[PDB]
Design a protein around this ligand. Structure first.
Ligand code: HEM
Ligand SMILES: Clc1ccccc1C(c1ccccc1)(c1ccccc1)n1ccnc1
Length: 454
């Protein structure tokens, strides 16, 4: 509404400009902005994404109330996105009862057991990753990990979310890979998304203008790939089985499968790149992990679902990387009605934000927060960690529904990569690594390392 909201409410924060709000402070990035507001304004602060008031919180008792306790009542949705079109039936886009329906219809799909049946599919794609990484190893040149890791995550998310085993997509150009690489190029963030927050009044203009985020041609191609696969009779196989049992629509099923591709693409690759950078800069950790990988899996044994859940240091290396690098950076909930959370009034429409990046590097909960130290997640130090400060996958009923799949997908990759390759930085390697100023938290310069046969 007005810019005097947090002023009248007595909530500290940066002074906004008349129409821009606090967007000019974003030239440093979402992460550096949140940490600056944390050190300056203390626990709770407020800013304006143009005209939208945003209230940031830090108290874990208050974060739990927003994410867990009062989720279904008030903080059920996130800030409405831009021109969604038919993707309104996406679980990340859906709101209120429509989302609660889609969340339940897809909840049995991401279960331990249903994920256990997908591991033989994901592991087979780790083999293609090992062969393609050894290819750039023979050239004796520093490997750009974004290519190999970006290919693996794309190959896994496509076969799991569409059944089609596209196998090597580093070079082959299946009509699926053609439309997939085209559709996965429709999310450059900066186009519209940033300016949408300044002018949310332009969102309804673009929706009626028939201009959508994903080109309908690729969408039409994705529909045939579902119908032709449906005409033949693993994410699509589990949602089709849900159809044969408020039911689940066929158009809705397409939108949900598209979300899984966007969700698990740059996220899985970035983390896999963030991890290998830390394994290279801290080779004492990489060696200790390879010893555990070879102990649980001798002679480059295949990674089993149960063995991955037994490798403990692998779990510690992934968790410590996700602390230093929360890909989402923030969690956001829209206040649906005037409420008082743990002794603070939040009016209707205000977006409540949790600076995950700032909390993951807050010196109160962490010691030497900037140094990569996997032992923070040891068995002796696993209990004193607040699950509402460390939220790389969010929390509450609206958390990352693809968390178990993502961690398994990435751990299966690291096994076959570490049990066959060693990683050391080159001259082009960025020390210290710089973070991207975009909206996904990526390595500023792509991770450039060297690989060995071992
Ligand atoms: C390791 C990589 C990943 C990270 C760090 C991650 C992190 C997150 C976070 C922080 C959220 C928001 C939680 C909240 O709002 O409280 C989220 C939401 C979501 N993630 Fe992920 N995610 C990852 C991979 C995936 C994958 C592979 C999938 C698909 C299987 C996926 C599907 C989703 C969906 C559908 C939502 C929205 C849930 C809803 O709106 O109800 N994510 N993710
Ligand atoms: Cl789930 C999703 C779908 C499409 C695009 C982005 C996301 C999302 C994300 C990830 C990193 C940076 C911004 C958004 C996302 C996060 C929070 C709320 C909505 C979407 N995501 C992908 C995997 N897990 C979460």
């Amino acid at each position: 509404h007005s810019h005097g909201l947090f002023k009248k409410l007595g909530i500290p924060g940066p002074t906004p400009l008349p129409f821009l709000g606090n967007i000019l402070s974003y030239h440093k990035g979402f992460c550096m902005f949140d940490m600056e507001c944390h050190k300056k304004y203390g626990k709770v602060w407020g800013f304006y994404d143009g005209q939208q008031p945003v209230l940031a919180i830090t108290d874990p008792d208050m974060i739990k109330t927003v994410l867990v306790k009062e989720c279904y009542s008030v903080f059920t949705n996130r800030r409405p996105f831009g021109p969604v079109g038919f993707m309104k039936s996406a679980i990340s886009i859906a709101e209120d009862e429509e989302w609660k329906r889609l969340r339940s219809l897809l909840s049995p799909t991401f279960t331990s057991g249903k994920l256990k049946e997908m591991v033989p599919i994901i592991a087979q794609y780790g083999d293609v990753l090992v062969r393609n990484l050894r290819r750039e190893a023979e050239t004796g040149k520093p490997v750009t990990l974004k290519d190999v890791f970006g290919a693996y995550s794309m190959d896994v998310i496509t076969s799991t979310s569409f059944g089609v085993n596209i196998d090597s997509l580093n070079n082959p150009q299946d009509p699926f890979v053609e439309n997939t690489k085209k559709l996965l190029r429709f999310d450059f963030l900066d186009p519209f998304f940033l300016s949408i927050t300044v002018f949310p009044f332009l969102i309804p203009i673009l929706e009626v203008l028939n201009i959508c985020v994903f080109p309908r041609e690729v969408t039409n191609f994705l529909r045939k790939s579902v119908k032709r696969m449906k005409e033949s009779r693993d994410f699509l196989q589990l949602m089709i089985d849900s159809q044969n049992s408020k039911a689940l629509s066929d158009l809705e099923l397409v939108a949900q499968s598209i979300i899984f591709i966007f969700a698990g693409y740059e996220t899985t690759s970035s983390v896999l790149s963030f991890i290998m950078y830390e394994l290279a800069t801290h080779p004492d950790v990489q060696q200790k992990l390879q010893e555990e990988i070879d102990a649980v899996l001798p002679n480059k044994a295949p990674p089993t679902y149960d063995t991955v859940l037994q490798m403990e240091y692998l779990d510690m290396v992934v968790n410590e990387t996700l602390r230093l690098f929360p890909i989402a950076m923030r969690l956001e909930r829209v206040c649906k009605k005037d409420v008082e959370i743990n002794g603070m009034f939040i009016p209707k429409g205000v977006v409540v934000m949790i600076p995950s990046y700032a909390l993951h590097r807050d010196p109160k909960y962490w010691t030497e927060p900037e140094k990569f130290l996997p032992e923070r997640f040891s068995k002796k130090n696993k209990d004193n960690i607040d699950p509402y400060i460390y939220t790389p996958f969010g929390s509450g009923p609206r958390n990352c529904i693809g968390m178990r799949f993502a961690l398994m997908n990435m751990k299966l990759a690291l096994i076959r990569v570490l049990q066959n390759f060693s990683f050391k930085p080159c001259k082009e390697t960025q020390i210290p690594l710089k973070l991207s100023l975009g909206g996904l938290l990526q390595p500023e310069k792509p991770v450039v390392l060297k690989v060995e046969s071992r």
